[PDB]
Amino acid sequence: MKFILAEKFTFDPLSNTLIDKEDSEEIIRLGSNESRILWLLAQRPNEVISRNDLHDFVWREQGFEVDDSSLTQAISTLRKMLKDSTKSPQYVKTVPKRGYQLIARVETV
Amino acid sequence: MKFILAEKFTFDPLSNTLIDKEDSEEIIRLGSNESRILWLLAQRPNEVISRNDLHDFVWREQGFEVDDSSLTQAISTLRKMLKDSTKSPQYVKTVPKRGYQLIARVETV
Amino acid sequence: KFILAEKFTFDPLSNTLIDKEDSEEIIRLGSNESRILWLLAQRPNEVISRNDLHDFVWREQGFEVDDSSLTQAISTLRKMLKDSTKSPQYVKTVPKRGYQLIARVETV
DNA sequence: CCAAAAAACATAAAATAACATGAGTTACTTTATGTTTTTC
DNA sequence: GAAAAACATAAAGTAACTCATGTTATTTTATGTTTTTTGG
Structure with missing residues (x-):
């Protein structure tokens, strides 16, 4: 299933x-990681x-165990990839002590 | 659910x-904090x-414990964002020894 | 649990x-080094x-590594083993034919 | 019914925690370079 | 003997992962203004 983000990007979680x-x-x-993150955010x-x-x-549900650091780093990387x-x-927003939030628009295919 | 306050601001409690x-x-x-205050007041x-x-x-219904000072400080900040x-x-009024109240006009969208 | 050359005890699950x-x-x-030794000892x-x-x-779905990776894992396995x-003394090369564990192998 | 005192709230710092980035590590794949074996 | 092929080792490349250090949001503190309360 592909997704359209913000009237600009097209994200394919398979590829x-x-x-x-x-x-x-x-x-x-x-x-x-960055694909899985973006996936769940869009879901x-x-x-x-x-x-x-x-x-x-x-991570954990996929059999990898990793510091909670690695999430903060993945988001930095995702934002870089999105030019946020x-x-x-405009795409991924931070809510301290609560997590992350996809504030861009999400359309399915 | 978006809100229009005082026929001037558009408040989006989710974004x-x-x-x-x-x-x-x-x-x-x-x-x-400033967002969740304005939400509850508008509601x-x-x-x-x-x-x-x-x-x-x-705060508490989010797993966060803070001194009552944090509310006074968020209200100050809310007002500053509102230029109240x-x-x-014009928008947020103090009711000493009670709390706060939204005196501005509130329309949904 | 394998014992190799009356010296090393290999545990392929850890x-x-x-x-x-x-x-x-x-x-x-x-x-890679472990799974190689696992098959050889088996x-x-x-x-x-x-x-x-x-x-x-190497079984990863969609991504198949080159033959190069095996030559490198054998190098690495021998180093770890002091071969x-x-x-x-542990792993032996048979050109055009593969590798072969010549060390002594006892179970449990 | 008032003036003064105590209490409540407001603002700007200041402290602190949470998160963002820059920089190093690690494990894996592959190449670059060096050695051996096979084949004619 | 010399080339062709096969295998060995060290060095380079990459993304995940981690650690050090920079940025900012959240919380609290110190000081200032207003509101409530109270005593005379």
Whole structure:
């Protein structure tokens, strides 16, 4: 199932690809963690997803155990890949002591 | 659920954004606390919400324990984001020894 | 639980190597290195083709590594084992045909 | 019914925790370079 | 003998992961203003 983010990007969770419609020819290539993160964020749009839940889904449930540091780093990487800014955010937003939240628009295919 | 306050601001309690109609091309980013206060106030318009009720919804009913000072400080900040005047209050009014109340007009969307 | 050359005790489920001279460092094998030793010890003094080794060690769906990776894991496994490339004492090369565990293998 | 005192709230620092980034590590794959074995 | 092929080792490349250190949000403190209460 592919997703359209913010009227700009097209995210494919299978192939783990992000295609910007402003470049369209250029395929942004996401890591697994960053794809799984973006997936779960889109599955719960405009909802604040706890650090434990992201950790659970992105790592523990897949058989990897990792510091809660590794989530803060994945998000930095995801935001880089999205050309988001930490302020002023347009795609991934931070809610201290609560988790992360996908404030961009989410359409399915 | 979006809200229109005082026929000037557009309040989005989920994204935590404030668009002033006079500054339509500019997003005002509230803290979580400031956002959750304005939410609860707007949800009972022109009603006095006790200090404790504000405290419980904004902090305790989220697993966060803080001194009552944190509310006074979030209100100050909320007002600053609103450019409310402390005494000739347009939006958020103090009811000493009771709490705070939203005196501005509240329309859903 | 395998004992190799009356010296190392290999545990393929924790990927660990205990040298019995100084049981004070649990020698930590990589995945590929462990799975190689696992198959060799499972079939002692047999020559296992490269492809059977590759199949056993590398199964990841969609991504198939080059034959190069096996030559490198054997190097790495021998290093960990203190195996000499001539004359081999644990893992032996059979050109055009694969590798072969010549060390003594006892179970449990 | 008032003036003064005590209490409640407001604001700006200041402290502190949470999160963001820059920089190093680690494990895995592959190449670059060096050695041996096979085949004619 | 010399080439071709096969195997061995060290060194380079990459993403995950981690650690050190920078940024900012949240909480609390110190000081200032207003409101409530109270004593005379």
